[PDB]
Ligand binder design. Structure first.
Ligand SMILES: O=c1ccn([C@H]2C[C@H](O)[C@@H](COP(=O)(O)NP(=O)(O)OP(=O)(O)O)O2)c(=O)[nH]1
Ligand SMILES: [Cl-]
Ligand SMILES: [Cl-]
Ligand SMILES: [Mg+2]
Ligand SMILES: [Mg+2]
Ligand code: NA
Ligand code: NA
Ligand code: NA
Ligand code: NA
Ligand code: NA
Length: 327
DNA sequence: CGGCAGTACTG
DNA sequence: CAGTAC
DNA sequence: GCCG
């Protein structure tokens, strides 16, 4: 279980010659849509990254959780020969599929369709492809959404959101989660969680907050924002700080009831692989873990989780600080 | 043999 | 719903 | 791809 161990085990990778090659195959399977095969590669890569020493034998590889017969044979190949033959036999469509699936709002199905239709470049997409509203925004910001910002800029973005929120309710709590809370030096976006400790004033704040951030010109595009019926949980969009030298940055906001704060904070801090491991563990124990609650198997019972530590405790896991969840 | 996390928008 | 995303 |  990745979630049972500190992610600092990957800081010293004794198998990088192997993992940098498996990573190429993992991405090739992912963009072609073979999600489960790609998942097995991703888990094997993490297992090899955390292992305490270089793997040197077939029996040694198979003994590692996440590494089976097939993955062992690839490891043996890279050790003996220095190369992996399959890397010379990846589908020729893969670079273009990767190019296309890096448009926000286009995944493997859209990328494969565009490839079948004869498109090979973003110029082809721009000039000939049918784009959803989201995809057109993704394409307009193609390079910007592939950039990571310095964490200092993420702080400024969080502060912009926080000041706008607290201006109409001074009791609102705002926390930047994701890679920022995990202590990374750069951030792909800013993930802001908003709640209110009184348990009720979080309701209806999206309309006021988004209007405020629009009034000051900070939000530039909206990707996901269901503003019609008042039940909105998330905003996914684009912002830009004022002044020269600024880039468009992705911004995600969630507003959660205080009763769900610990589970929402745990979810939104991640990492994604950490969450998936923790959720899979919870299931083996007759529980279910989401961004709303830790509950028993089904209508199940909601377990009491006032803090993140309580979730770890109820799953039998030692607590990990956010920086140690970077799987 | 079949799951592989659990959930929220979009159209 | 399938697709996509956090 | 891996796992129970
Ligand atoms: O598939 C996912 C993706 C994200 N998440 C959670 C964990 C993640 O840390 C958080 C924010 O998602 P981001 O896509 O913003 N990733 P993160 O902030 O970890 O890294 P970065 O934004 O720097 O790429 O949402 C999941 O649970 N499942
Ligand atoms: Cl291939
Ligand atoms: Cl907490
Ligand atoms: Mg993020
Ligand atoms: Mg995000
Ligand atoms: Na290691
Ligand atoms: Na194994
Ligand atoms: Na995409
Ligand atoms: Na909308
Ligand atoms: Na599954």
């Amino acid at each position: 279980w990745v979630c049972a161990q500190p992610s600092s085990q990957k800081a010293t990778n004794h198998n990088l010659h192997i993992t940098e090659k498996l990573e190429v195959l993992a991405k090739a399977y992912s963009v072609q849509g073979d999600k489960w095969r790609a998942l097995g590669y991703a888990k094997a890569i993490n297992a090899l990254k955390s292992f305490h020493k270089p793997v040197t034998s077939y029996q040694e590889a198979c003994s590692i959780p996440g590494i089976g017969k097939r993955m062992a044979e690839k490891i043996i190949e890279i050790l003996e020969s220095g190369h992996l033959r399959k890397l010379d036999h990846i589908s020729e469509s893969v670079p273009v599929l990767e190019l296309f699936s890096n448009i926000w709002g286009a995944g493997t199905k859209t990328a494969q369709m565009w490839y079948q239709q004869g498109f090979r470049s973003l110029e082809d997409i721009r000039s000939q492809a049918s784009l959803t509203t989201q995809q057109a925004i993704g394409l307009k910001h193609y390079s910007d959404f592939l950039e990571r910002m310095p964490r200092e800029e993420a702080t400024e973005i969080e502060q912009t959101v926080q000041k706008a929120a607290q201006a109409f309710n001074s009791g609102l709590l705002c926390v930047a989660c994701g890679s920022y809370r995990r202590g990374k030096a750069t951030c792909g976006d800013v993930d802001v969680l908003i709640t209110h400790p009184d348990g009720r004033s979080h309701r209806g704040i999206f309309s006021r907050l988004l209007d405020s951030l629009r009034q000051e010109g900070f939000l530039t595009d909206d990707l996901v924002s269901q503003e019609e019926n008042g039940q909105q949980q998330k905003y996914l969009g684009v912002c830009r700080l004022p002044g020269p030298g600024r880039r468009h940055r992705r911004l995600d906001i969630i507003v959660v009831p205080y009763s769900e704060f610990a589970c929402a904070l745990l979810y939104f801090t991640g990492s994604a692989h950490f969450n998936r491991s923790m959720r899979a563990l919870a299931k083996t124990k007759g529980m279910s873990l989401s961004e709303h609650a830790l509950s028993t198997a089904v209508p199940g019972r909601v377990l009491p989780t006032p803090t993140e530590k309580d979730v770890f405790r109820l799953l039998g896991l030692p607590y990990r600080e956010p920086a140690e969840r970077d799987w």
